[PDB]
């Protein structure tokens, strides 16, 4: 079977999970109470596909998920909201006290006595999986539980399982906007987790998605419910090939093999091209060429950076809907013609293409318009280094004067680890600078 397990850590994780599971339930026709009318109506097929759901005797479908907050206020909304009967009661709240935006608390002192329960639940979920595997970890840098507990969880997972893909969806800090003062310490102390144990990590930024909502969907005052919906669309586009038939399928192994050149380079950038409002859904053809061109615009990126300042090392285009390979090939040829898009010499092909027949679904109340075709582009580029470098500068401004360090030190953490983390980041940045250099004969 073709199965994945979703972990969501922290408040950002829980809310993104809410949006994602809403989208999956609408895609597969599953009611909020777990029942499917369509399965009884038809009497055939596996519409409650095993990629994200498990079927019990009475026709109920349980998500293959577990999320943890260390703060009951977030998950207790799930226990009371419309999806209270969908999830298993094992949504592991243990928030007698939260991490207080402290990496050390989430990683060392309060992260324990909760990790055992999480590992037991994950083991129980994995034992039910007689087939393919891959973890999908949603979280946020800048928080305590989203950084420390994620670090501990991935450290334990890499030993318990080892040879299983562990995809990451992280809420990276914005260049200017923020909601905390101790954000850079937590963000830089997560480097070890996202380097050693992760196999592929996608980073997204709140400023970029705010810009996308403001400019494309004409939303003047967006909130996190739109950001989570867009991230859910991206995730569904990634994993569509495991669920629905298509002309060209792309498993997670195919996805990683054609996008990760070297082991230390697994930080691609994500883009959804046909983001458009209902009013602007008209006045536009929305053909394959237009969406493929829109994927490459700097303005549509989900991270605040500029691919024109770097070099593309590999791209994965995943199409859904009324799409044909011929127009896709024409679009890739047109993209290769342009000289504003630069490709490294050591990757002459530089494109992986996957096509799926199922078109995207529209969530009622959402601000995305129904469309016939869509594309998700996932491209590994050196410009992402910029998004790190700025953050590093901020960290330095707080570490020269030793500000806020006593909170981390008093919760069981050596000072030197700070320096170690920074050095690790520097090394990674240097690597991204060196792969982009043209070959010398």
């Amino acid at each position: 079977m073709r199965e994945c397990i979703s972990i969501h850590v922290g408040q950002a994780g829980v809310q993104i999970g809410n949006a994602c599971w809403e989208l999956y339930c609408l895609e597969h026709g599953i009611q909020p109470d777990g029942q499917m009318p369509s399965d009884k109506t038809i009497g055939g097929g596996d519409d409650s596909f095993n990629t994200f759901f498990s079927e019990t005797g009475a026709g109920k479908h349980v998500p293959r998920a577990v999320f943890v907050d260390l703060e009951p206020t977030v998950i207790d909304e799930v226990r009371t909201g419309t999806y209270r009967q969908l999830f298993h009661p094992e949504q592991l709240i243990t928030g007698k006290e939260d991490a207080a935006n402290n990496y050390a608390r989430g990683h060392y002192t309060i992260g324990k006595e909760i990790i055992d329960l999480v590992l037991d639940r994950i083991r129980k979920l994995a034992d039910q999986c007689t087939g393919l595997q891959g973890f999908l970890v949603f979280h946020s840098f800048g928080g305590g539980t989203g950084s420390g507990f994620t670090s501990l969880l991935m450290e334990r997972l890499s030993v318990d399982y080892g040879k299983k893909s562990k995809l990451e969806f992280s809420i990276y800090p914005a260049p200017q906007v923020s909601t905390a003062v101790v954000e850079p310490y937590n963000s830089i102390l997560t480097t070890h987790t996202t380097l050693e144990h992760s196999d592929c990590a996608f980073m997204v930024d709140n400023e970029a998605i705010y810009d996308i909502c403001r400019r494309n969907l004409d939303i003047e005052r967006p909130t996190y419910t739109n950001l989570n919906r867009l991230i859910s669309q991206i995730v569904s586009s990634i994993t569509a090939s495991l669920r629905f038939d298509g002309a060209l399928n792309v498993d997670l192994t195919e996805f990683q093999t054609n996008l990760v050149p070297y082991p230390r380079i697994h930080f691609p950038l994500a883009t959804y091209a046909p983001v458009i409002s209902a009013e602007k859904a008209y006045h536009e053809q929305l053909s394959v060429a237009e969406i493929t061109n829109a994927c490459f615009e700097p303005a549509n990126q989900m991270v605040k950076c500029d691919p024109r300042h770097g070099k593309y090392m590999a791209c994965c285009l995943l199409y859904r809907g009324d799409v044909v390979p011929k127009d896709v090939n024409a679009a890739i040829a047109t993209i290769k013609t342009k000289r504003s898009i630069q490709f490294v010499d050591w990757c002459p092909t530089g494109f992986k293409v996957g096509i799926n027949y199922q078109p995207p679904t529209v969530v009622p109340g959402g601000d995305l318009a129904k469309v016939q075709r869509a594309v998700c582009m996932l491209s590994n580029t050196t410009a992402i280094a910029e998004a790190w470098a700025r953050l590093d500068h901020k960290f330095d401004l707080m570490y020269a004067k030793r500000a806020f360090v006593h909170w981390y030190v008093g919760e069981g953490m050596e000072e030197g680890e700070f320096s170690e983390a920074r050095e690790d980041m520097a090394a990674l940045e240097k690597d991204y600078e060196e792969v982009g250099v043209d070959s010398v004969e």
């Binding site: 060392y108 082991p263 006593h406």
Partner: protein, 408 residues
Amino acid sequence: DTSEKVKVYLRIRPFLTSELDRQEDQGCVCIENTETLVLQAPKDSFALKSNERGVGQATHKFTFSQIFGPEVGQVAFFNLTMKEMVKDVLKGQNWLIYTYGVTNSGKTYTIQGTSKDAGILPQSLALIFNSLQGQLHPTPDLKPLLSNEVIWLDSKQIRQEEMKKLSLLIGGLQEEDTVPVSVPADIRFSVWISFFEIYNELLYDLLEPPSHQHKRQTLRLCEDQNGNPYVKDLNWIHVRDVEEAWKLLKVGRKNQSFASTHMNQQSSRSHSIFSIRILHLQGEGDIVPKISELSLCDLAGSERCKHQKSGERLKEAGNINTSLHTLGRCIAALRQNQQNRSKQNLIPFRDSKLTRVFQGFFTGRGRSCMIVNVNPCASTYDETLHAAKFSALASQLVHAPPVHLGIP
């Protein structure tokens, strides 16, 4: 000053036969010179050569005032480091000895320990007493309670102190210089000793025997007439010969708190301060004769809290870490208080009990010195690195060209 800095001193313990057979001398530590050390991780076959994300060498250079290898003996180590400082103390000035280390670093062997291979403590004590031999007052008549004030004793108080020290010595009793005299026959030298600790930012005495399970010795930190700080209600004991003082410190260390760790070992969980005060009283004597204080501070080694995350120890571990961090900041300020920089900075000594007790010596009423003992074995390499980062004058990254694997 002639660029005093703080005069850190690094000591490397010799390898043991019981550990060399286990392949612990992996070239991790080696002395580039008497001022510089280089630290290298256990890479290649010493660790897992697989993966190794940018850990090809991981070389770090550290600068020290002086580095003492295993070739230096106990007496040789003491003579070249503390003999000048013992002379300075007997002149009339005060001094301190910070000591930092971890299990197997040999700090307990370096400062105190075997009577034959005398440490810094017994050697300094012997030099001090042999120096003033024949200049001891016949009886105690004066208490160095405060750093600049005195308390007079009557006959009954003297007898009470005699009973106190006799009861302390008899209980828990087991088996475990003059030529350059400053001024004999004009000034009598009287020696008093005290010993206490900081534990969870609470002060606790150690000369008091195990009176009860509860440690109701929460000494308060007051300030004198001039504002100088001082521990209130601390016991002090007069000493007549080196053996009495040494034995009293063995009793005090016996009382000292200890706790297990994540191996089958035991270690201290407190910052223990030992103080010896010499009263110089001339024939006139006047009031509060001159006072000279030599202090030693054994600091709890900074230890990671992941492996130790079981039980309430974690709490005190965090406290220990916090205290040491504050101490480092103070030293950094004292390394900037040097005229080297003109901006200057305030010394945040009030942020912790340990720094506050040592206020006069960051203010400029005394001089301080630090020792760091390191285990050269590879299995403790990370710990050694942390110790270097605590105590190094400066650090350098050679940038290690073989690092950055994966990429061609």
